[PDB]
Scaffold this active site. Structure first.
Site, PDB file in Angstrom:
ATOM      1  N   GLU A  11       0.773  -1.222   0.000  1.00 38.34           N
ATOM      2  CA  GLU A  11       0.000   0.000   0.000  1.00 38.34           C
ATOM      3  C   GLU A  11       0.806   1.274   0.000  1.00 38.34           C
ATOM      4  O   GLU A  11       0.259   2.359  -0.116  1.00 38.34           O
ATOM      5  CB  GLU A  11      -0.736  -0.013   1.329  1.00 38.34           C
ATOM      6  CG  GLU A  11      -1.661  -1.230   1.346  1.00 38.34           C
ATOM      7  CD  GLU A  11      -2.883  -0.965   0.532  1.00 38.34           C
ATOM      8  OE1 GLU A  11      -3.082   0.081  -0.051  1.00 38.34           O
ATOM      9  OE2 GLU A  11      -3.683  -1.956   0.444  1.00 38.34           O
ATOM     10  N   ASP A  20      -6.828   6.649  -4.235  1.00 41.69           N
ATOM     11  CA  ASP A  20      -6.217   5.339  -4.428  1.00 41.69           C
ATOM     12  C   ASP A  20      -6.373   4.921  -5.864  1.00 41.69           C
ATOM     13  O   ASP A  20      -6.824   5.664  -6.738  1.00 41.69           O
ATOM     14  CB  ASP A  20      -6.827   4.275  -3.465  1.00 41.69           C
ATOM     15  CG  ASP A  20      -8.295   4.111  -3.799  1.00 41.69           C
ATOM     16  OD1 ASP A  20      -8.846   4.592  -4.770  1.00 41.69           O
ATOM     17  OD2 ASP A  20      -8.917   3.316  -3.000  1.00 41.69           O
TER      18      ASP A  20
END
Ligand SMILES: C=CCc1cccc(C)c1O
Ligand SMILES: [Cl-]
Ligand SMILES: [Cl-]
EC number: 3.2.1.17
Length: 162
Positions: A11, A20
């Site tokens: 991540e 994202d």
């Protein structure tokens, strides 16, 4: 290697609100803030989560704090899921990390519809499961990452993460 190092690799870490891969407001170590496309909803959310007015930025400590909670929430979600629990407990430790990653990335929801894979994982049909896994939007949208996780399921080792 462990779950944190593993997910911190998948991540990344960001101290400023970011979008994202699905275009959603996120922060820290993959911490989703909101689905809404309003930045302000996002900052509100950030404020609520940290306990202070951040104005969109946080410290490392703060990110790590969210991260701890989030890992915890994921696992706990697993164990609370009747469809998930049994599979997860049937697995060895590395493989279990792979299950957490998926859940961290996609929710208990996203993972629950992987019925067929689930079943194969439970039966220890590694390669079979790995192929099935690849037949999915998940693999197709985030292939490099899905690849790592799948390999992780397939082999039970940390090789994908070197
Ligand atoms: C494809 C699903 C793998 C899997 C097995 C057990 C538990 C979880 C949360 C999980 O994602
Ligand atoms: Cl919080
Ligand atoms: Cl990817």
């Amino acid at each position: 290697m462990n779950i944190f190092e593993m997910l911190r690799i998948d991540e990344g870490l960001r101290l400023k609100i970011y979008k994202d891969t699905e275009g959603y407001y996120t922060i820290g170590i993959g911490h989703l803030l909101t689905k809404s496309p309003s930045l302000n909803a996002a900052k509100s959310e950030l404020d609520k989560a940290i306990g202070r007015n951040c104005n969109g930025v946080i410290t490392k400590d703060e990110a790590e704090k969210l991260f701890n909670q989030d890992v915890d929430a994921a696992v706990r979600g697993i164990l609370r899921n009747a469809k998930l629990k049994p599979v997860y407990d049937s697995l060895d430790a590395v493989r279990r990390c792979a299950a957490i990653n998926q859940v961290f990335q996609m929710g208990e929801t996203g993972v629950a519809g992987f019925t067929n894979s689930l079943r194969m994982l439970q039966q220890k049909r590694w390669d079979e499961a790995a192929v099935n896994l690849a037949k999915s939007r998940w693999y197709n949208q985030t292939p490099n990452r899905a690849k790592r996780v799948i390999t992780t399921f397939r082999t039970g080792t940390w090789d994908a993460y070197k």
